[PDB]
Nucleic acid binder design. Structure first.
Ligand SMILES: [Mn+2]
Ligand SMILES: [Mn+2]
Ligand SMILES: [Mn+2]
Ligand SMILES: [Mn+2]
Ligand code: NA
Length: 326
DNA sequence: CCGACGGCGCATCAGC
DNA sequence: GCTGATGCGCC
DNA sequence: GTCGG
C-alpha cells in the first residue's frame, strides 16, 4: 500500500493494453513495473527514483511524475471516458470473454451485463458459466474458507484412492490471508513421465467432487487440467457461500517439484524466474528444467529432487513460497 | 537500434 | 476425422 | 514498455 496509487495506475494501464490495445508485451511490461514498485520499501518521491528499479523505464517514469504531481494520469482519465474502451474492459471481466470476443460483442451492441444476460445464446459454454457467476467470481476467498475447502478436497481425494496426493497451491501455499480461487495440484503414482498406467485419473477425482456437490460447474476439462466452479456447503439456515473458481492440475508424480513450483507462482514470479533461467541457459516449465544448447535447442531434463534444486541451477538463493508473491 | 519478452492445457475453427 | 492457428485460460 | 547486446 506504500506506493499503491502508482501500482494501481500501472495495473490499470496494463489492463488497458491487454484488453483494449491487445498489446500483450506492454501488458507484461506494466505488470512487471507494478510488481517491482510494489516491493520497493520506500515511498517513491519521483519518477527518477522509480526509474532506478529494473522494469521501470523512461515512459513509466514520466507517468509517475505526472501522477505524483496531480494525483491522476490524463491518459487514463481519457480511457475511462471512452465508451468503447470502457465497454471492452468490462466485458473482459467475464471468464471466457477475452479481448477479441469483447470487441466482437461491443461491435454487435452487446456492451452491458444486461445485454449479456439476454444474449446467452451468443455465448460458448465457458462464457455462459462465467456470466452465471460473474458477481461471485469477483469475491476473494478468506484463508479460513480455503482451509475448509482444502479439507474437503484432500479428504474426498483419499476416498477415491489413498495414493493420490492433492496439494493446494497458488497464493494459499504462499501463505496469503485471502485467495482469488483454489488451485489444486494432483498426483498419483500411476501417472509418471514414463507411463500412464491407468486412465480417467483426473475424471475420477472430478466426478467424486461432483458427487458430494463440491464441484458445481465445469468450464473446461481434459486429461490433465480441470477448470471449474465449486462451493462450500453451508449449515442449516445459513446463507450460501459464494461460488468459487477451482483449477485442478494433474502432474506426473516424478515431476512434482517443477509442477508445484509452477503452480505456487505467483505468475509474475514464474515469468521472472523462467526469464532468468533463459539468461542462465536453462528453460523451466511445469515438468522439467532443461539445458539450452549452443543452438538454443533444449536438452534432456536435469535431475531434480526438491524445489531448491531448480533455484540452484539458475544461481538463485532459495525463496520460500511466502516470498514469491510478486 | 533491435529482437526478445515464460511456457503450456483446453476449446473452437478453417482447411484438407 | 486430423492438424495448425487462434483465443482464453493457468501459475 | 523495457532491457541487454
Ligand atoms: Mn489462484
Ligand atoms: Mn486458479
Ligand atoms: Mn452463487
Ligand atoms: Mn530480455
Ligand atoms: Na475474461
Amino acid at each position: 500500500t506504500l506506493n499503491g496509487g502508482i501500482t494501481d495506475m500501472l495495473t490499470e494501464l496494463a489492463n488497458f493494453e491487454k484488453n483494449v490495445s491487445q498489446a500483450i508485451h506492454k501488458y507484461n511490461a506494466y505488470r512487471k513495473a507494478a510488481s517491482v514498485i510494489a516491493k520497493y520499501p520506500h515511498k517513491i518521491k519521483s519518477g527518477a527514483e522509480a526509474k532506478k528499479l529494473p522494469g521501470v523505464g523512461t515512459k513509466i517514469a514520466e507517468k509517475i511524475d505526472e501522477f505524483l504531481a496531480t494525483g491522476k494520469l490524463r491518459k487514463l482519465e481519457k480511457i475511462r471516458q471512452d465508451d468503447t474502451s470502457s465497454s471492452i474492459n468490462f466485458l473482459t471481466r467475464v471468464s471466457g470473454i477475452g479481448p477479441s470476443a469483447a470487441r466482437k460483442f461491443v461491435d454487435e451492441g452487446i456492451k452491458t451485463l444486461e445485454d449479456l444476460r439476454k444474449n446467452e445464446d451468443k455465448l460458448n459454454h465457458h462464457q455462459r458459466i462465467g456470466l452465471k457467476y460473474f458477481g461471485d467470481f469477483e469475491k476473494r476467498i478468506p484463508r479460513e474458507e480455503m482451509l475448509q475447502m482444502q479439507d474437503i478436497v484432500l479428504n474426498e481425494v483419499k476416498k477415491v484412492d489413498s495414493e493420490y496426493i492433492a496439494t493446494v497451491c497458488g497464493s494459499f501455499r504462499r501463505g496469503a490471508e485471502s485467495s482469488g480461487d483454489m488451485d489444486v495440484l494432483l498426483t498419483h503414482p500411476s501417472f509418471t513421465s514414463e507411463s500412464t498406467k491407468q486412465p480417467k485419473l483426473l475424471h475420477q477425482v472430478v466426478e467424486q467432487l461432483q458427487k458430494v456437490h463440491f464441484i458445481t460447474d465445469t468450464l473446461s476439462k481434459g486429461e490433465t487440467k480441470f477448470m471449474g466452479v465449486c462451493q462450500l456447503p453451508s449449515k442449516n439456515d445459513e446463507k450460501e457461500y459464494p461460488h468459487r473458481r477451482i483449477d485442478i492440475r494433474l502432474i506426473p508424480k516424478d515431476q512434482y517439484y517443477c509442477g508445484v513450483l509452477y503452480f505456487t507462482g505467483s505468475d509474475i514470479f514464474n515469468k521472472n524466474m523462467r526469464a532468468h533461467a533463459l539468461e542462465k541457459g536453462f528453460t523451466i516449465n511445469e515438468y522439467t528444467i532443461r539445458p539450452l544448447g549452443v543452438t538454443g535447442v533444449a536438452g534432456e531434463p536435469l535431475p531434480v529432487d526438491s524445489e531448491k534444486d531448480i533455484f540452484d541451477y539458475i544461481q538463485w538463493k532459495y525463496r520460500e513460497p511466502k516470498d514469491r508473491s510478486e
